[PDB]
Structure formats: C-alpha cells, structure tokens
Symmetry: C3
C-alpha cells in the first residue's frame, strides 16, 4: 500500500501553517484506510500558477494511490482536501484541481523493489 | 471540463515573461475549445534538469484534460506548445517533451467534488 | 523513444553531487536500453515533504517511458534507482517511492509532433 499526495500552490510558504504536512498525512490515512506509514505528502508553495486566467490563490494537486480510488471515494477525498486547502491555505475550492490516479502495485517502487 | 498544463524548465525565472501564464491560458482555451475559466497553468523555472545528457535549455511538460486528447489533437497541441516555448522561453523544440493525459471526469476533483 | 525521470526530495541542494544528473542519464540509458539522447532527468531538492509522517530524508520519484515498463523491469529499475539515491543522496530505500508509467507513443509530444 502506498498513497502520495502533492499540492502545488501560489500561496507563500509563510502562509502554510505549522503542522500542515502532519495533518495531510493523518487525514489521508483516515480517508484511504491505509496506515499512515505508507502515506507520503509533498507541499509546494510560492509557485507561478494561474487558474482560469487569474493568479489569485489556487492549487493543483494529485493523489496517487494503490487502490482506494473510484467515483464515490474521489468525491469524498475532494471534499476533505478542498476543505483543508480552504481552511488552512485560504484557497477557494473552486480554484483547486485534484487529479486522482489508481496505481497498479507493480508500477510502484519502494525499498529496492516494487509492491507487486 | 478542465485542463491543466505544467511546464518544468531550467530557464531562469527572469526569463519567463510575466504574461506567459495568460498567453498559455488563452491559447490552450482556443486549442481545446474550452472556456479559459477551465484552464489552469503552472510554470516551474530554474530547475535542475538535463535532456539527452545536456543542460542547455529544455522543458518537460504535461497536459491533462477531461477529453480533447487523442492522436491528432496531441500532434496539434505539440506544435502550439513547442511554438510558445520556443518564442517565449527560447527553448529548442527538440528539447521539449509533453506527456498527454486524457482524464476521466470521475478522477478530477474540483470545488469539493469531482466532475463526474 | 523517450524516457523521463524525476526525483523530488527534501535533501538540500548542496548534498546533490556534481555529476548526479549525468549519472542518472547514463544509468537510465543502460537500464532502459535507450540511447542517452532520448533520456531526460529532473532533480528537485529542498522540498517540503513527509513520508510516513516523518520529515527525515525521503524521495518521491517517477519514471515515464515509451515501453520498457513492466513487473520485472520495474523491480530492476527500483533496485538501481534506490541504490543511487542511497549512495549519492543518503536516502533510505524504504523512504523512496517511484511511480512507473508506460506511455503510449501517441501521448508523448516532442518537437512539434508525437511519437506515434
Ligand atoms: C526519430 C525521432 C522521432 C526520435 O526518436 C528522436 C531523435 C532523432 C534524431 C532520432 N532525437 N531525439 C531526441 C530526443 C527524443 C527523441 C529523439
Ligand atoms: Cl468508489
Ligand atoms: Cl498503474
Ligand atoms: Cl484526436
Ligand atoms: Cl483518468
Ligand atoms: Cl517486465
Ligand atoms: Cl499513455
């Protein structure tokens, strides 16, 4: 099992609250049902980005996961993650995209091998 | 509908025009047939990169879109995007890769939900 | 053909050895059997990341390739790449993920066209 979440945003680094990586780890572990040991997170502030031609605060994110991806699940993840970006980074949820990827275990490397 | 274009390059931030993200937004809106509101753009300069073993200017890019991806369309997008990168960032078109992704609406989160 | 490898890490830039990009290019050319001219590499240090809730050294990587991706092949790449990250960046192999992508030629743009 593995899942990784990346958020790219134009919000300044100083605006990312202390503990944000830990919150994302914890809340994604809950949402996906995976042990937090297997969750990786990456937050990239201060980016040169635009959404709909506006450079107001926005985010482009991805969640790659071995399983636990699907229509209803992804709706739930989007409510969780957009809520966090709004409440913690002050980004409007209508200025967030999250791309979701269901990875085959054979296509995820870890510890000198793969999960297959 | 949604599309997102990301360009990672070793060219310096000062060499990225201030209007580039808007230029990309408008040209991609035209190319995909989508209103510009649905187009997001992310440019990442000053990267540590090599292309073919050389660190002359280069770009690694991706275009993710809900639909409007396919053999012929992608041939056309490559001309558009190579043209823009050549003119505005001074990158030779033979030092550009663009990975194309046709996303299912169910796998694109936006505004606390997905597009499905 | 085409292949591209990206490594995102929290390790500082100063700890990435001189010659690291060239080592990645050459080792990936050997591993994939593709000429180095077709291989692009991208290293992104100093990132805000966590792996398993910890911000000890870690890496999130991806290898996109037209072909040369599969169960056994990916195991082999993971041993190679984790080995390099361990010896050169001092990152433990159990704090590395590598996502592997077999791209269709029609979905890889280069030089005003695609590979199809
Ligand atoms: C024949 C073309 C499509 C090709 O494979 C490439 C060529 C030619 C010169 C064989 N150079 N090159 C550099 C980076 C990526 C791809 C290529
Ligand atoms: Cl589901
Ligand atoms: Cl996969
Ligand atoms: Cl098409
Ligand atoms: Cl998809
Ligand atoms: Cl294989
Ligand atoms: Cl593909």
């Amino acid at each position: 099992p593995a899942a990784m979440f990346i958020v790219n945003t134009n919000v300044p680094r100083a605006s990312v609250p202390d503990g944000f990586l830990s919150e994302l780890t914890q809340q994604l572990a809950q949402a996906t049902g995976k042990p937090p040991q297997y969750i990786a997170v990456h937050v990239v502030p201060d980016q040169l980005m635009a959404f709909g031609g506006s450079s107001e605060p926005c985010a482009l994110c991805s969640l790659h996961s071995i399983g636990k991806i699907g229509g209803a699940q992804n709706r739930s993840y989007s409510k969780l993650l957009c809520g966090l970006l709004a409440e913690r980074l002050r980004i409007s949820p209508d200025r967030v995209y999250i791309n979701y990827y269901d990875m085959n275990a054979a296509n995820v490397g870890w510890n000198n091998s793969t999960f297959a």
